[PDB]
Amino acid sequence: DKEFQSVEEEMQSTVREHRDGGHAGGIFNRYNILKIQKVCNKKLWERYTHRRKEVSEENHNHANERMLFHGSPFVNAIIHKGFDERHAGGMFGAGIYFAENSSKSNQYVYGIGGGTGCPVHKDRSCYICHRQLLFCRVTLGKSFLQFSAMKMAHSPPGHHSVTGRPSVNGLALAEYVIYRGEQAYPEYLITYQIMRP
Numbered sequence: 402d403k404e405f406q407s408v409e410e411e412m413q414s415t416v417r418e419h420r421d422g423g424h425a426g427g428i429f430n431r432y433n434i435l436k437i438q439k440v441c442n443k444k445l446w447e448r449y450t451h452r453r454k455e456v457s458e459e460n461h462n463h464a465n466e467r468m469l470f471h472g473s474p475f476v477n478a479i480i481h482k483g484f485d486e487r488h489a490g491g492m493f494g495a496g497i498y499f500a501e502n503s504s505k506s507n508q509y510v511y512g513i514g515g516g517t518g519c520p521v522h523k524d525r526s527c528y529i530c531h532r533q534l535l536f537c538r539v540t541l542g543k544s545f546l547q548f549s550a551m552k553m554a555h556s557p558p559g560h561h562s563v564t565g566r567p568s569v570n571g572l573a574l575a576e577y578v579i580y581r582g583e584q585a586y587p588e589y590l591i592t593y594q595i596m597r598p
């Protein structure tokens with residue numbers, strides 16, 4: 402399957418060396434991809450496409466959709482109930498955060514800063530336990546570009562998302578923030594392990 406090889410390639414090629422030396426997400430240069438499942442939730446898909454059409458109409462007939470990663474200990478709840486801003490602290494406030502680098506999303510799979518790592522071994526660098534990440538369709542619409550912390554409750558006026566851009570004093574890598582759960586669809590569920598270098 403070419404569609405699934407495309408997802409594996411995005412997962413592998415977007416890995417970066419992290420500033421925390423692997424503290425949050427573990428030490429690795431690549432993953433062992435175990436499974437890639439396409440999520441088919443009709444109710445969530447229509448909530449997503451309905452919002453996407455509204456955003457496109459408010460953004461010069463352009464949804465500004467991107468495929469982005471999301472790491473969370475609550476992936477199962479997300480694939481069933483969708484993203485939920487009511488469950489959203491954060492550099493850009495009360496939003497739902499996505500990354501274009503899979504290894505950045507991997508830092509959130511076991512909690513903020515990697516939490517205490519895997520449930521079985523309490524290891525943020527566990528090579529044994531299988532992890533899950535989502536590869537999502539995200540509607541950014543008119544995205545507000547920001548470099549420094551800007552604690553928002555909602556998108557800035559006239560905007561549909563916030564894009565955090567890398568800066569000397571700030572972010573190492575980009576991040577994308579939405580403030581309405583219906584602006585993302587959890588399209589692929591990736592089951593994987595981080596691999597020992």
Ligand SMILES: Nc1ccc2oc(=O)ccc2c1I
Pocket residue numbers: 470471472473491492498499500505506507509576
């Ligand atoms: N602050 C922040 C930045 C990036 C993130 O990427 C994810 O995948 C999930 C959560 C997340 C968070 I909270």
Ligand SMILES: [Zn+2]
Pocket residue numbers: 519520521522523524527528529530
């Ligand atoms: Zn483990």
